Amino acid sequence: GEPLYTEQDLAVNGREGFPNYRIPALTVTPDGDLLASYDGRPTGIDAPGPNSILQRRSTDGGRTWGEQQVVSAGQTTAPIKGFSDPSYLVDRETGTIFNFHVYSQRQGFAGSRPGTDPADPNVLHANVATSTDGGLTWSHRTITADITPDPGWRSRFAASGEGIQLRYGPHAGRLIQQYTIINAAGAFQAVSVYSDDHGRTWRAGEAVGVGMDENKTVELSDGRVLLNSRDSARSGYRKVAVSTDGGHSYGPVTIDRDLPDPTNNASIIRAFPDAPAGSARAKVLLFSNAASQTSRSQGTIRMSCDDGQTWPVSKVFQPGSMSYSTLTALPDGTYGLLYEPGTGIRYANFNLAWLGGICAP
Fold this sequence. Notes:
The chain has one helix and 26 strands. The chain has one helix spanning 352-355, and strands spanning 5-12, 21-28, 34-40, 52-58, 69-72, 82-90, 97-104, 125-131, 139-142, 155-158, 161-162, 164-165, 175-182, 188-195, 203-204, 215-219, 225-229, 237-243, 254-260, 267-270, 285-290, 297-304, 313-321, 325-329, 335-339, 344-350. A hairpin with a 7-residue loop joins strand 8 and strand 9 (139-142).
């Protein structure tokens, strides 16, 4: 077809009320609206910065965006409070939308103490905002206690981006959002937080690996769940693991040399989310990240046609500065990409023809 690639800034540092914007999350509502979420950062810092979770909406497929609205408002005056690092998750079965994010007071990720009391200012809490009206209004919950089965887990935060809902197997319908936790020994591990009752209750699976960080999951053509993680041990590559269950546990973690990474967030999605199990279309994956091993630059999109075994196709979308990026499949068959060019947050839209591969006809 005719390749397509366009982009436009949704937030630029210093404009619209905040000196700094970071951390993208993107999704499509059941109605077809596009939602972009990110941090508004009064002091240009991660938690415990008194950050706010912001959102912009598009009702015309991404061409035009409405005004910036506040999902969770941070508090800059004592008692200081902050909300950061959003991740959207849409229950396609019920139409409910969730926005996961940090709730900080005195401590950030590294300084969080063990404990689960929402009133304790020394712990980094896990919050979830739920909307049943397409992202218009939100109800909030601190779920730290629900997702801390091991009293030794002293800190955690949802990986910003977008979570998933399983379509196949015995756990079809399950909502999965990835988190990074710090255990008693001080190791960074990955863990899936999930719900089998459409968001009523959330629970944690078994933690995996060491030297883990922000991580994402995708459902493969056979129902297996692939975990793709930032490596806090800085190997120069992404770490991967797979789950064959529900009541999540993953196998051993290994470095994937096909995916160079400078220790930064990335996104991995199903190109055809609705394809039947085992079909050719169900094996197609798209991955976005900074391909440079020395800096956050050279943003590229890679495509796999074999459940992530090989990535034969790749194209650079941003030769320069490029930190976090998230992908979502749009209703018109194209793909949305929210990323950080260094100036705030930018939205891009591309199609498969743009990726190229063969110089046909």
